[PDB]
Design a protein around this ligand. Sequence first.
Ligand SMILES: Nc1ncnc2c1ncn2[C@@H]1O[C@H](COP(=O)(O)O)[C@@H](O)[C@H]1O
Ligand SMILES: Nc1ncnc2c1ncn2[C@@H]1O[C@H](COP(=O)(O)O)[C@@H](O)[C@H]1O
Ligand SMILES: Nc1ncnc2c1ncn2[C@@H]1O[C@H](COP(=O)(O)O)[C@@H](O)[C@H]1O
Lengths: 51, 289, 100
Amino acid sequence: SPPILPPHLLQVILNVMLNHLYALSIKDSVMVLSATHRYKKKYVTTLLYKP
Amino acid sequence: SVYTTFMKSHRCYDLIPTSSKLVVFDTSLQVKKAFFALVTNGVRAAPLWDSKKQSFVGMLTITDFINILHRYYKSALVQIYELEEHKIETWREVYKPLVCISPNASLFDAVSSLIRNKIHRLPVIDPESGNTLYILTHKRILKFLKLFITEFPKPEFMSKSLEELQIGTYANIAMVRTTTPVYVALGIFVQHRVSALPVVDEKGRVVDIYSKFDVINLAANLDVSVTKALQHRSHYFEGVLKCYLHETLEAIINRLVEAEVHRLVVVDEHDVVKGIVSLSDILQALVLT
Amino acid sequence: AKWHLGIRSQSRPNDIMAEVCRAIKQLDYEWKVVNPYYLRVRRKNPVTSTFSKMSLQLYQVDSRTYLLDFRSIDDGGGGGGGSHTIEFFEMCANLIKILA
Ligand SMILES: Nc1ncnc2c1ncn2[C@@H]1O[C@H](COP(=O)(O)O)[C@@H](O)[C@H]1O
Ligand SMILES: Nc1ncnc2c1ncn2[C@@H]1O[C@H](COP(=O)(O)O)[C@@H](O)[C@H]1O
Ligand SMILES: Nc1ncnc2c1ncn2[C@@H]1O[C@H](COP(=O)(O)O)[C@@H](O)[C@H]1O
């Protein structure tokens, strides 16, 4: 049986998680994906809007 | 010059916040969803990703939203309603190569790049990963220069008045009256390619300011007056930030940075507008000393 | 906005890993089975000729529910004038598509 979700690996975010894929519920055939990445000591959360 | 030496000795990376958000649009995205995504995310520009070419190809900013709204308004009067389902790629086709900068490039290169290309948005793109890291602005740069440069040695010109330096624009100032429709504002924006318009009265006294930024609030109606549109003023407003010709570069730079606006309205004793001093003028003057 | 981590399913863990191998094989990506519940997948960009890598890890979050996690691997990947990050999103989007 698969490992249990790590406690800090949040299942849902409302408005260790580095490099992890998050996504909004698809709507209007448009998909919105997100993730936070690191460049040296700078972090950026990128959202991509893709039909 | 101290500014020139500082800019040349620092990388763009140094300007990047510890944490930020970046919004990217696939160019197949419909324009109407693109601009609703800007508003929702409270962002003013978005890199464009061309999936077929597998690379960034341009930027989508508030200026484009304004171009498109203006076109939409005119076309509608002639029963043309196509801009709706337009994809970003198709609207780009209807009509500016991507200009970007590596995080390892100097601050000097960043500034030159913004001035030379007459843009307000400069994506910092890592050549190794290919990722956009951050979007650089005039505002961010000036704040950084003000914060990280020692007060002394202080260049003599920092103590010179606007009158002496002749920084900014003092002729043909695009302005609107309080009784001016939003759609007339758009036409002025599009024609003059100017980031904001002072709102004056009968005698020419500034009483408000209408920025390109105050327009995108409308993607979340173009008939209302400029005054009426500036009532959904989301942020606490103390009135119009202005300056006088006798004031020094130093005082003006300090005012700009502390207030975090893109320009001041130059005015006389009677609050009559005489010119504009923008971060564009400031940064240019500093890069040419 | 409500953001969800990866994707959830209520099929059997074995069944889930089966479908993801098939989705992978369909896109013609390469994949390596580390654990029964952990896969590394590689892909060469048709345009930029660069390679991109990511992890697929299956977690249990419920008694009846499982969560497939996507993670990008910072192995010096992408950068072909492409974007490691954007290309990560696209690999995922394609996979998520084939599923559903
Ligand atoms: N870094 C950039 N590279 C290419 N085009 C840009 C860039 N920044 C802005 N633009 C475009 O130039 C025009 C002026 O935008 P702005 O400078 O945001 O007022 C808009 O049509 C933008 O889409
Ligand atoms: N309302 C305006 N009327 C005329 N010129 C302006 C106005 N706003 C800005 N400028 C000038 O246009 C150039 C770009 O400024 P900005 O649009 O603020 O980046 C600067 O040289 C400004 O002095
Ligand atoms: N000189 C100014 N005085 C007062 N408010 C301003 C001034 N310039 C910009 N603003 C406001 O500040 C916000 C940001 O505009 P901008 O400076 O164009 O980024 C907008 O809502 C403007 O209406």
